[PDB]
């Protein structure tokens with residue numbers, strides 16, 4: 001499954017705007033994920049007690065987590081599909097330490113697309129959203145193959 005260089009440029013041009021303030025984008029993506037699919041918050045032992053969007057917004061630890069997640073995903077997207085080294089540690093921790101099913105990776109993908117669609121209409125028109133969806137589908141397909149190698153059905 002393979003993206004064209006033009007699709008990768010549409011992915012990297014919206015990611016450049018995310019990088020103006022990766023912490024703010026991470027907060028919005030995690031609030032969207034937890035609001036839309038509340039069951040995903042139960043996987044975070046440090047954050048599952050948060051009850052409202054205001055508590056989520058005020059959590060310094062959740063802000064730091066959002067920066068970690070988006071910076072790891074950004075490094076994966078900048079490899080333009082050559083991300084085997086980056087996916088190894090991530091697949092292992094998400095399969096075995098955190099136990100994150102592929103369905104929850106689909107939910108965070110949905111949250112990312114929703115937040116980029118809302119914040120970045122200048123760089124997230126239909127063709128760019130289609131390229132980001134392809135990049136995230138590639139990421140989830142390769143993560144799912146690694147999960148199977150690691151012994152996790154998820």
Ligand code: HEM
Pocket residue numbers: 040041043044045046047065068069070072073089090093094098100104105108
């Ligand atoms: C775009 C997909 C994702 C990326 C790039 C990502 C990235 C990361 C990174 C870099 C870390 C820190 C190091 C590690 O333990 O691997 C992390 C931790 C974690 N991830 Fe993810 N993650 C993703 C999706 C998810 C989803 C969807 C969930 C749950 C629904 C999840 C649950 C967790 C948890 C529970 C931790 C430990 C958090 C803590 O220390 O409090 N991840 N993730």
